[model samples]
Target: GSHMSWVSFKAAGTSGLILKRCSEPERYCLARLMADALRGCVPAFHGVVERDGESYLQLQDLLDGFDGPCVLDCKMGVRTYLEEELTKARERPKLRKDMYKKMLAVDPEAPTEEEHAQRAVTKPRYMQWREGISSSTTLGFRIEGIKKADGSCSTDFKTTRSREQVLRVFEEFVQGDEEVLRRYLNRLQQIRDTLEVSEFFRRHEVIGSSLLFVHDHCHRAGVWLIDFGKTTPLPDGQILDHRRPWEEGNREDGYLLGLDNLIGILASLAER
Candidate 1:
C-alpha cells in the first residue's frame, strides 16, 4: 500500500491532496509556513479537518505533477530530539528496551554492561546514540530513505556515513542528470537565503524536520521542507542560530549546518 503509517493519500478521492495525521505543533508550524515568504519551499497547507474524531492536516500532494517520481527523504540537523523531550524523559524516566535491542542489532558493543544488564535505555540516550551512529553526527543530516523512478524503495542508509559516501549516494540518486542536480542545488541555495530572513524560522527550533526531494523522468525536480512533528517555538528571548552546536540549554538545531553540507554535496555532483 502507498499509505504511510502516519500519512495517507487521496483525501475524499482527491488525488491532489493528502491527509497527514496532525500534531498541534506540526499544524501550527504549517500555518506559520503558509504565511512565510519561504512558503513555496514547503508543502502547501490547505487546512486542518476532523475525521472520525481525529485531526488530519490537508496538504498539497508534492508528487502531483510527476510520473514515476524518484524521492529522497533526508532528515536534517545534528540532533533529532528537542531538549524539552530529554527533560521530560528525565522527569518521567521513560525507558525503551526496544531501542536497546535495535542498538544491539546494529552493534552488540553499543550497549554497555549497565545497559545490557537493564535491557533498556532512556529516550534521550537512544536519540543521542542514534545521532552518533548515523551521518547526523558528522554530516549534520542523514538519508532516511529513497524511492527510485522504478518505484523500488531503499531505507537502509543508517550506516551510510561520510561525505564521500553521501556524494556517491547523490550520484546514484540523480543518475548523471546534471540539470536535475543543478536545480536541486539552486533550490537549496534559495532556501538558505530565504531562511535567514524568515522570522518563523528564526523563532523556531526545527528539530527532526526533513528535506523531501522529488524528481521524475521528465526531469521536473523540487525539494521541500517537511515533517514538523518535533518543531517547537523558541521562547520570546531565545533565538537559534541553527548553525551553532547545541548544548543542554542553548537549543540549537544545526539545520543550516546540514543544509550547507547538502548543498556542498549537490554542488560536487553537479560539477562532475
Candidate 2:
C-alpha cells in the first residue's frame, strides 16, 4: 500500500508558499534511481512512482514489516552489525596495490617505504564507492515550517536507519543464498583493500566520528546509502587511520582496523 500527498510551505528567505506536490518530478527521478540501485543489489524494492508532483518510493516499512524481536537494548549486536558491514565494504588489497603502483609510476620520487605503507594502510574503500555513487548530486533537508507550539521548524532529511536492523533483516531473508553471501564477503574485501590507501583516512578523520559510524553501521550492514544532498568530494593526500596512532590525535582508531577486528567479532558471535 502506497500513499502520496502535497506539502506546500514558505521558503525561509523567500516570499509565497512553494507548492511542491507529494512527489516532485525531479525528486521522483532521483528516487527512482535510488530504488533501482537498491532493487538491483537486494531485489526487495519494487519501484518508485511520482503522482501529482509528489514522489513516493516503495519500501517495506521497517516499523510495520519486521517480525523479529527488537534488539534495541543489545549494544554489542549493534557494534557487531557495524563491524560486519564495514569489513564488507572495505577496499580490496589488489585495487590498492594497483593505485599505489600507478602513483609510484607517475612520480618516480615517491614517499619512503614506511610512508608508502602508512598511506596504503589507512585509505577507506567505501569513500571511493561514495564518490562514484553521488558525484553530481545535491542532497539536503527541506524544512516545512515552524511548529505551532515548540516554535521549531518541522524538518525532513534522509538517512539509513541502523546497521544491526538491516543485517538482521538481510541475514534472516538470504540465509539460503550462499552465492549472495560470498559476493557480500567479496564486496567487503574490496572495501578493505581501498581503505589501505592514505587519502581516505585523512578525510574520514576530519569528517568526524560520524564517518566511523557510517562506515561501520550503514555501509557494512547492507543498508543502502540515501540522500546525496550534503555530499562532498574527498581531498587529495588524505590518509585513513588503519593503525590509529595516539600522537595523531587519538580519538580511538580501533574502528579503523577492519578485517582482523571483524573476524574476532565473528568469533565472539560464534561463542554466543
Candidate 3:
C-alpha cells in the first residue's frame, strides 16, 4: 500500500520507522506526552521529517519487535469528536452521504424520514449516531480495527455491541492466551495510574484517540495510546476530569471510563 493509507512504513523506512501524515497537534501531543507521564505508553517520536517534498510524522514502529504480530486497535472514549468540531459543523454544515450509506448498512431504520429523504447527515450528527450504535455509548470504547498474525484484517465491527461480543473479539485477538490477556489487563491499570498525573492529559480534551494492542508468537504483549489528532487544549485554567460523564458545555472526555470498562472485561476473562 503505497499512497493508500494515512500510515505507511514501506515508503522507505529505517526499518523501525512508521511514517504518518504530519498533524501539528498530534506531533505536539506526542512530543509533550513523551516527556511528561506517558513516555512508555506512547510511540517514541522522531519529529516531523520531509520526504519527496511532503512532510510526514516519523515515529518508532510499535510492531518492530514483533514477528507475526496480532494487532487490535480500540478507539477509546465515549465521544470521538470534540465540542469545537461540533461547533464548526454547526457553523458550516456539510452533509456526508457516505455516512448515511454506512448507517443504512448497519441498520436500515436508523435514519429519520427527513434524513432518509436527504440521504445524508452532518458530521456531528453522524458521529453521535455512530457512538450510540457502537459499544462506545455503553462501554465507552469500541473496536476500530484488528489484524491477526496471519495478516488477515477486519474493520467491520459496526454493530459489535455488548460484552459478549466485545469479549469474543478480545479472546480471538490474543488467541485465548491467558498470559497475554493478563498482561493487557495489567497494562490498562498502569495507564490509568499514569493518566492521573499526566500534565499533558490534564490540559487537553482527548477525543478519537486509540489504544493500540500488539502481541506476537513469543507471547510478548504491549499496548500503547495513539492518535491524538482530535485532542485539544481546554480553555486557559480549565482542566477536566477525563473519567467524568460529558454534558453539553462540559468537556469531559470519558477516557478513563473506557479504560475502566476495558480493564473490567479483561479482568473478568482472567477470572474465567
Put the candidates in lDDT order, highest first: 1, 3, 2
Off by over 4 Å in 1: 1-12
Model 1 lDDT, full chain set? 0.86
Q: Tell me the lDDT of model 3 at 261.
A: 89
Per-model TM-score on C-alpha atoms: 0.94, 0.27, 0.94
TM-score of 1: 0.94
Residue-level lDDT of model 2, residues 10-98, one tens digit each, is 11121221222233432433344344422222213334444456544443322122222111100111111122224544543323455
Summarize candidate 3's per-residue lDDT along 62-153 as a digit string, tens digits. 87777777889999999888887788887988888999998888889988998899999888888888898789988999999998776688
Q: Which ten residues in a row have the lowest lDDT in candidate 2?
A: 69-78
Stretches off by above 4 angstroms in model 2 are 1-173, 206-240, 244-248, 263-272
lDDT agreement with native, every candidate: 0.86, 0.29, 0.84
